[PDB]
Curated annotation (Swiss-Prot):
UniProt keyword list: Nickel, Periplasm, Signal, Transport
Gene for this chain: nikA
Record GO cellular component, one term: ATP-binding cassette (ABC) transporter complex, substrate-binding subunit-containing
Keyword set includes rRNA-binding: no
PANTHER family: NICKEL-BINDING PERIPLASMIC PROTEIN, PERIPLASMIC BINDING COMPONENT OF ABC TRANSPORTER
GO process terms (BP): negative chemotaxis; nickel cation import across plasma membrane; nickel cation transport; peptide transport
Provenance organism: Escherichia coli (strain K12)
Domain of life: Bacteria
Protein name per Swiss-Prot or TrEMBL: Nickel-binding periplasmic protein
InterPro entries referenced in this protein's UniProt entry, alphabetically: CntA-like, Peptide/Ni-bd, SBP_5, SBP_5_CS, SBP_5_dom
């Protein structure tokens, strides 16, 4: 059946609560649940569940006119009351969404009629529409599936308005979705999608080679990159590599010795040949990153000066900061303390380990001793929240989060970016300007604030940008060309057309 496909994912999709995070998988929430406005690749949003909208002079009161023909997959109507109830359910858990500034901005949501939905904001929050378009949390489950009129304590059935319906889930085995035959929009050509739960990238590759699965879709960890290169040459297969979607980097802890020293952070940024790293560990499949955000990211084309690979300059910077080589040793010392930096990473991630070994070797060449701390996933996430790291692998979030939402989250102390920035003397200024950039409606001032925030982060060498990574696809040829979604975390199954 050419209208039924089998793919894979490292874990189950989760319960598909539209308003919660782990272990819900974002792409799967986006398959079932829909936004008021839909994000487009050009950076705009289009009408979706909302046909149209107006806003007040002061930018704080927004009124959406909703479609009147939309049903949840269980036949119950989608109207302004159902939408308002969803906003209430989300904001009843407001603390958990405070990383996303819109969750702190919404004062009230009212259904003025079946088709009129009014949303009032604290301030004139410019990324309002783009954050409504995110996969979560502002998407809509049928209110009949709330538990005690809430969603934060669980849901009943995951009933959305979207083009896919979860048929069944089997923990550690599979998830099955089917086409919504009563979808308000266009019918997908695919009728059934089976997700096999396959946690290991080599095992995913083997599953494709045997014919067990029709499609692999993911980022640079989807499968071994040496295997992907071979697949791309195989005339029996189809492969794709998108244009870059987000940045992979190291975050350097400005609050912990010795990365608290600007000279040390600058020297680290001169010591890595990123092209060689990409050609070594990533088999040349990704692009070199000189800045936190690629120049193609909105508001980020600033002409920031790259720190090109220059081990001679890296050594000179350390020497001038007092980090010199003792007799017969390769690791520098200052006041008898060795230049030692801990790099923690997920120890079972072979790609992360490979890049870690490359970074360790590169930094030894300029006299810095990198200790590799490979730990389980839970421990690494705890380290990121607590700032218990010297260096960590880190990534941006792709459109439409980059740059406004990623920057906004830098103010939240329980995440890696704040922790890495905590030792900066101008961190209060940076957090102040991040608050201003989200609220100001002077577009000249908005661009000037983005420039200042990103220039400070660049000049202070908080990050060591490594690569701009791409989405990758491996598929049976009969599926045809596989499209990409405007939102980097979504998979546009409804656009596959065999
Ligand atoms: C905690 C954490 C930190 C860093 C990265 C991640 C991984 N998540 C999935 C990223 C993936 C890419 C898009 C953004 C997305 N989330 C939003 C979301 O999960 O909906 C960022 C975020 C920020 C703050 C809190 C939470 C829970 N999440 N999780
Ligand atoms: Fe997240
Ligand atoms: Mg560079």
């Amino acid at each position: 059946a050419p209208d039924e496909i089998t793919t894979a994912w490292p874990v189950n999709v989760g319960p598909l609560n539209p308003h919660l995070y782990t272990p819900n998988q974002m792409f799967a929430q986006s398959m079932v649940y829909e936004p008021l406005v839909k994000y487009q690749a050009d950076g705009s949003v289009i009408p979706w569940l909302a046909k149209s909208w107006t806003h007040s002079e002061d930018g704080k009161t927004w009124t959406f006119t909703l479609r009147d023909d939309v049903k949840f997959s269980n036949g119950e109507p989608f109207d302004a009351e159902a939408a308002a109830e969803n906003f209430r359910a989300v904001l009843d858990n407001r603390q958990r969404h405070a990383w996303l500034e819109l969750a702190n901005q919404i004062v009230d949501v009212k259904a003025l009629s079946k088709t009129e939905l009014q949303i009032t904001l604290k301030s004139a929050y410019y990324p309002f529409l783009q954050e409504l378009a995110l996969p979560r949390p502002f998407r809509f489950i049928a209110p009949s599936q709330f538990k005690n009129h809430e969603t934060m304590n669980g849901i009943k059935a995951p009933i959305g308005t979207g083009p896919w319906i979860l048929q069944e889930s089997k923990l550690n085995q599979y998830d099955v979705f089917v086409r919504n035959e009563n979808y308000w929009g266009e019918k997908p050509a695919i009728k059934k999608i089976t997700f096999n739960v396959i946690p290991d990238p080599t095992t995913r590759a083997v599953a494709f080679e045997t014919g067990d699965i029709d499609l692999l879709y993911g980022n640079e960890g989807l499968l071994p990159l040496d295997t992907f290169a071979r697949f791309s040459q195989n005339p029996a297969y189809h492969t794709q590599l998108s244009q870059p979607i987000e940045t992979v980097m190291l975050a350097l802890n400005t609050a912990k010795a010795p990365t608290n020293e600007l000279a040390v952070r600058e020297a680290l940024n001169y010591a890595v040949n990123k092209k060689s790293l990409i050609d070594n560990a990533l088999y040349g499949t990704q692009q070199v990153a000189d800045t936190l955000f690629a120049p193609s990211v909105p508001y980020a084309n600033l002409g920031l000066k790259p720190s090109q690979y220059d081990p001679q300059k890296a050594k000179a910077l350390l020497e001038k900061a007092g980090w010199t080589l003792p007799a017969g040793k390769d690791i520098r010392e200052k006041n008898g303390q060795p230049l030692r930096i801990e790099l923690s990473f997920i120890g079972t991630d072979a790609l992360s380990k490979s890049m870690a070994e490359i970074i360790q070797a590169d930094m030894r060449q300029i006299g810095a001793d990198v200790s590799l701390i490979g730990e389980e996933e839970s421990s690494i996430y705890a380290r990121q929240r607590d700032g218990r790291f010297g260096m960590i692998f880190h990534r941006t979030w792709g459109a439409p989060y980059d740059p406004h939402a990623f920057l906004s989250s830098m103010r939240v102390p329980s995440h890696a970016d704040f922790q890495a920035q905590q030792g900066l003397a101008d961190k209060p200024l940076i957090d102040k300007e991040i608050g201003e950039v989200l609220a100001t409606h002077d577009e000249t001032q908005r661009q000037a604030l983005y420039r200042d925030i990103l220039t400070r982060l660049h000049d202070e060498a908080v990050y060591l940008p490594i690569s701009y990574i791409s989405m990758m696809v491996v598929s049976k040829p009969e599926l045809g060309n596989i499209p990409y979604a405007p939102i980097a975390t979504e998979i546009p199954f409804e656009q596959i057309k065999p």
